[PDB]
């Protein structure tokens, strides 16, 4: 199969290059407009404040940028991201390999502990996921016994029926773990339907960009509402694990 | 297993809560550092530029923040959506790393990302399995020869197998963990510790995004920045093995 792997590799590269093109096309125009808007703001400020050089305003913006990059907020001038709830959640983001990173570690000690925390934590969680996966699948499988029986009593051809059970399966998961959360988050996080689906999927794929994080919002007095979602993550990931493995099989079928 | 899974669940929860405590203890002290630094920058600038009101510098910073949020870069090229950087971004998706050091702003970008990942991750998953095996068998072909030398000094062959496999991952580690840590130390102006943090956050596919190489072609070794994406590809199997061996060790648990 060594020939096939080189074919597969180039297929992936082509996929990445095509991804590159699509992304650039959709995203670069607004990155250039942002750059131009920053320039417009500088030139406007210079015109308004004659005691400021181009190069000195430059350092201001660089120093501001680095501080925002450290999680500083432009809105305030006063003076918890690491409250026990959020710190728990952060630990959760590691072992799940999601890694939102919407809050970064600042201490050398924090980073060094994180290494060993993950090295031990991820495989441990992997094991529990396998566990939850089997138990979940079994429970659903117990359920669909009734459903395929009704189709047999409805006299539906049997091979059709278990595809229909799995077809029922796919819908059932999606409703409870994709659609329910998207609806949940839409109301709770004040996101759009599309933002919420983007979040859900980026989450369950364990990509964890960190552009969208459920509960993170500072204002909300619902700290428990964050750990409760973390149970959704635990139940959801196996479901998605199944979907991900199965779509691979569909690609196996095509190849 | 019913006992086992609830036991395992409780173990993991305890682990999370203990993690929470350690992290909070180490990180809560320094939470306001970035705010302190932004305030220091403002107040230092007002002292230096008398014709600027606090409230006017305020709006400047808000307007700057919104522009950076749009992917503007402090400039004194640099496109994160040029073909090089965009390729790399696509790479961060299918690997499920997802640094997010550059975010999508268009609803179209997000919608395409969904289908790109949903189809892309399993495809890469399959190739990873494939590349994993090919290298693994080729490494094992190498392992046998090392096993022969151990065989010829009268080490019991089961002991030799463990020794070779231990040598197996140790060779992997040195090849893929230490070289990059040294590479990044020199290339990125990071500390040895920052670089190992980056490497491991990367190969675990956590992908915080606090530390990134970038794989944007610049100068001295511009081609080498996208070439790092190949280090990622070759490294991940090694780590896959390590994580699955710790998984087997947790099976032993």
């Amino acid at each position: 199969r060594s020939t096939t792997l080189l074919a597969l590799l180039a297929l992936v590269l082509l996929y990445l290059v095509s991804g590159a093109l699509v992304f650039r096309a959709l995203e670069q125009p607004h990155e250039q407009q942002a750059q131009r808007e920053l320039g417009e703001v500088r030139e406007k400020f210079l015109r308004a404040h004659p005691c400021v050089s181009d190069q000195e305003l430059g350092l201001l913006i660089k120093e501001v940028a680095d501080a925002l990059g450290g999680g500083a907020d432009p809105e305030t001038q006063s003076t918890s991201a690491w409250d026990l709830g959020s710190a728990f959640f952060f630990s959760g983001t590691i072992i799940t390999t999601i890694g939102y990173g919407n809050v970064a570690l600042r201490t050398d000690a924090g980073r060094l502990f994180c290494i060993f925390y993950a090295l031990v934590g991820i495989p441990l969680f992997g094991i529990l996921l396998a566990g939850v996966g089997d138990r979940l699948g079994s429970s659903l499988r117990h359920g669909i016994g009734h459903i395929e029986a009704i189709f047999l009593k409805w006299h539906v051809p049997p091979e059709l029926v278990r595809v229909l059970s799995a077809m029922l399966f796919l819908l059932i998961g999606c409703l409870l773990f994709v659609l329910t959360p998207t609806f949940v988050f839409c109301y709770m996080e004040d996101w759009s339907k599309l933002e919420a689906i983007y979040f859900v999927i980026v989450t369950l794929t364990t990509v964890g960009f960190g552009d969208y994080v459920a509960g993170a919002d500072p204002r909300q007095d619902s700290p428990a509402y964050q750990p409760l979602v973390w149970f959704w993550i635990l139940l959801g990931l196996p479901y998605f694990a199944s979907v991900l493995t199965t779509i691979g099989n569909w690609l196996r079928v095509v190849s | 297993r019913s006992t086992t899974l609830l036991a395992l669940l409780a173990l993991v929860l305890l682990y999370l809560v203990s993690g929470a405590l350690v992290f909070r203890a180490l990180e809560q002290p320094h939470e306001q550092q970035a705010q302190r630094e932004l305030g220091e920058v403002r107040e230092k600038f007002l002292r230096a530029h008398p014709c600027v009101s606090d409230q006017e510098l305020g709006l400047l910073i808000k307007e700057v923040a919104d522009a950076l949020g749009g992917g503007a870069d402090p400039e004194t090229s640099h496109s994160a959506w040029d073909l090089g950087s965009a390729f790399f971004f696509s790479g961060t998706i299918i690997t499920t790393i997802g640094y997010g050091n550059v975010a999508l702003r268009t609803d179209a970008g997000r919608l395409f990302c969904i289908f790109y990942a949903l189809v892309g991750i399993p495809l890469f998953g399959i190739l990873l399995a494939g590349v994993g095996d090919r290298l693994g068998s080729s490494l094992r072909h190498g392992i046998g020869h090392i096993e022969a030398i151990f065989l010829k000094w009268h080490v019991p062959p089961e002991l030799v197998r463990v020794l070779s496999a231990m040598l197996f991952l140790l060779i992997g580690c040195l090849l893929f963990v230490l070289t990059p840590t040294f590479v990044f130390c020199y290339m990125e102006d990071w500390s040895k510790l920052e670089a190992i943090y980056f490497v491991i956050v990367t190969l675990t596919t956590v992908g915080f995004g606090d530390y990134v190489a970038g794989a944007d072609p610049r100068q001295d070794s511009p081609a080498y920045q996208p070439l790092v994406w190949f280090w990622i590809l070759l490294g991940l199997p090694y780590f896959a093995s390590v994580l699955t061996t710790i998984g087997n060790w947790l099976r032993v648990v």
Partner: antibody
Framework: EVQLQQSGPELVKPGASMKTSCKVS????????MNWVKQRHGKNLEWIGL????????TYNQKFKGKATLTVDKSSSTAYMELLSLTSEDSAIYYC?????????WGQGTTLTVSS | QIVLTQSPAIMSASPGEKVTMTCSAS?????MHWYQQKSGTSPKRWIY???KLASGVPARFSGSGSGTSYSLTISSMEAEDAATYYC?????????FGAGAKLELKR
């Protein structure tokens, strides 16, 4: 009436350095950025660098990094430019001018002659 | 390192003639400024921020443009208008100038 009064023409030997001055009046020296411009013959005008008289902050055209030192005396509201190890290529008219985006007020200029 | 091109470098106008001289940028620029210089004397800020007239400048002068091309115009050439006109930019440090456009009287 804002006004930039430069010191008179200077003639110095090859290799010597030279310092010329620009005293401002009719506005606050420290409120506005001071720049220097080189006009060789009557041809292309070259920005040398700026100083912020209030902060002493300086940046130079990379072409003049080594050549020029900008300083100010806040009390005498005078800007200075120093040019180093002079060659015949430095023989030109030098202006001080004010501005952080347009050069809105200029000195009368000073002619540097480098010659044995 | 933005390059400003003023062509032609020398041009002549009869009095009453409309004159337009151009300044093209190597890459895009938000605003162009213009100076008038008459031999023996310093440049004078003539037009700034593309189309704003400096204090003394008579209304027969205008400026215009955007992106990579900018233009100074005299509605009706006058004798006192014979001079060198320079464009300059500061949308990018370091600020840069054109090599100048000398305007002579036709006779």
């Amino acid at each position: 009436e804002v006004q930039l009064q430069q010191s008179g023409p200077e003639l110095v030997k090859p290799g010597a350095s030279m310092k010329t001055s620009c005293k401002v009046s009719g506005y606050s020296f420290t409120g506005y950025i001071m720049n220097w411009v080189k006009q060789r013959h009557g041809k292309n005008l070259e920005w040398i660098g700026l100083i912020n008289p209030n902060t002493g902050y300086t940046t130079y055209n990379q072409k003049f990094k080594g050549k020029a030192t900008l300083t100010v005396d806040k009390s005498s509201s005078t800007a200075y430019m120093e040019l180093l190890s002079l060659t015949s290529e430095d023989s030109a008219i030098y202006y001080c001018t004010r501005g952080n985006y347009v050069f809105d007020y200029w000195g009368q200029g000073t002619t540097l002659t480098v010659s044995s | 390192q933005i390059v400003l091109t003023q062509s032609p470098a020398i041009m002549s106008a009869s009095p009453g003639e409309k004159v337009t001289m151009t300044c093209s940028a190597s890459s895009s620029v938000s605003y162009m400024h213009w100076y008038q210089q008459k031999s023996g004397t310093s440049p004078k800020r003539w037009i700034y921020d593309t189309s704003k007239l400096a204090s003394g400048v008579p209304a027969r002068f205008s400026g215009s443009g955007s992106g990579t091309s900018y233009s100074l115009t005299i509605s009706s050439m006058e004798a006192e208008d014979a001079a060198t006109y320079y464009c300059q930019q500061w949308s990018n440090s370091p600020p840069t100038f054109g090599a100048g456009a000398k305007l002579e009287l036709k006779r």
